[PDB]
């Protein structure tokens, strides 16, 4: 994973996102959704999803939330006050905590001013909570700004490392982007059965055709403009959509 003071930032983009494999994986110790309850994620579409990744203590997962304070949310990673995404977290004691301590994951604890939301600060200038220049070296009332979790495998819960991923769905002003999934059912030809062909909603009997579209045309229309043929997306065969039976 990535440190807590220099988190990562992956910009998930146009694809097919299935937040159900996440939501039901039962391996996550914390799955909170803020802008939007979790079950309705696989039914919405945004412009961009960002995923931020890092590693913190066990009892610091309550500062990854909109409107908190503490050494993590103050100056390591700040979430805006109208957050939209979801926060996921799971214990990782066996991977990150070795025998004797990892001392591989750092975390800033000495800053001048709290972070703006989603702001990042990887500098390493010597602090000076005193009242005298430092020139650039340790001493009294002026210290190095980074500390290290010394993770050990024999640590009580709440001191073992947790890995955190923060998904943030954003909606700028584009034309569209990623979105939930869309299962595909079967096709019963010959029987006035309601149908939906990737957007085309209708009713009627479906029948095997003998017309030939051009290999970019989806459905056919009549004079007076009514849909009368479609192409099945999966098998790519033309089917005549004759209106239902009436009189």
């Amino acid at each position, epitope marked *: 994973f990535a440190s807590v003071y220099a988190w990562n930032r992956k910009r998930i983009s146009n694809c097919v996102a299935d937040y159900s494999v996440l939501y039901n994986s039962a391996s996550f110790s914390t799955f909170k959704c803020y802008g939007v309850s979790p079950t309705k994620l696989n039914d919405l579409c945004f412009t961009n999803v960002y995923a931020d990744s890092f590693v913190i203590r066990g009892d610091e997962v309550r500062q990854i939330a909109p409107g908190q304070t503490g050494k993590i949310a103050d100056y390591n990673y700040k979430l805006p006050d109208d957050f939209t995404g979801c926060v996921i977290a799971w214990n990782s004691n066996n991977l990150d905590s070795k025998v*004797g*301590g*990892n*001392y*591989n994951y*750092l975390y800033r604890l000495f800053r001048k001013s709290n972070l703006k939301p989603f702001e990042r600060d990887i500098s*390493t200038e010597i602090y000076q909570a005193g009242s005298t220049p430092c020139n650039g*070296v*340790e*001493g*009294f*009332n002026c*210290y*190095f700004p*980074l*500390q*290290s979790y*010394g993770f*050990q495998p024999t640590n009580g819960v709440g001191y073992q490392p947790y890995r955190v991923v923060v998904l943030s769905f954003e909606l700028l002003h584009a034309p569209a982007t990623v979105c939930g999934p869309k299962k595909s059912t079967n096709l019963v030809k010959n029987k006035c059965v309601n149908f939906n062909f990737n957007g085309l909603t209708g009713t009627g009997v479906l029948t095997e055709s003998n017309k030939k579209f051009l290999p970019f045309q989806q459905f056919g229309r009549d004079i007076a403009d009514t849909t009368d043929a479609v192409r099945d997306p999966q098998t790519l065969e033309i089917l005549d959509i004759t209106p239902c039976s009436f009189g």
Partner: antibody
Amino acid sequence: QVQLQESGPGLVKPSETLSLTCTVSGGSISSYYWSWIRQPPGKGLEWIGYISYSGSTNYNPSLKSRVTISLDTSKNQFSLKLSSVTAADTAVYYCASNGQYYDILTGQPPDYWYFDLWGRGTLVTVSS
Amino acid sequence: DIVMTQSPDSLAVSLGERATINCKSSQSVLYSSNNKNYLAWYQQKPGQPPKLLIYWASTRESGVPDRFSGSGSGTDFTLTISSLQAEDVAVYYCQQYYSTPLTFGGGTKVEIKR
């Protein structure tokens, strides 16, 4: 308490690089400042520099831009590189540290370097 | 930056006597705040790594006998032994620590006689 040991390249031809690794191997470590110190044969001690677990290097201004202390927290080893060796680098080199619990919430930084743990030393000479 | 000067560089102090050492400073210590001036004292036998004796200016730790005793404060420091012993022939250093450039003394040769 842990114990420390070194592994240099015995001799060294002039104007080469110098390779030394000091491997921590003990119980539960509690140190935060790993230092190398230097000693010419039958002369006075001299402090080279340290490295912290926060990656905060610090060097002695008589060997600046000749020393580089690294830190590998996947083997519990740290190391020192003297490039462009000279005839006046004939010394025994120790690695030493302080076995004391570390809290900046109670305590300034220059409280943790009086060199409690000590290595075993390895002779060296810019010979050839 | 800051240097200590160990004046008595050779001592022929036999058994049951006085064994004293001076080490001054080039600046001031004690950190004008609470307490606790910043010295240490190291014993080095030949063919050994040094061992430490004194934590802050006088206080010692488990492992050294109580016959090694530290004194002095401010900028003048002196370590006192227990009339010597059988195996005290060593070289002694007073390391300081005030900011970064950790400096050591010059050495001392606590001999004896026959």
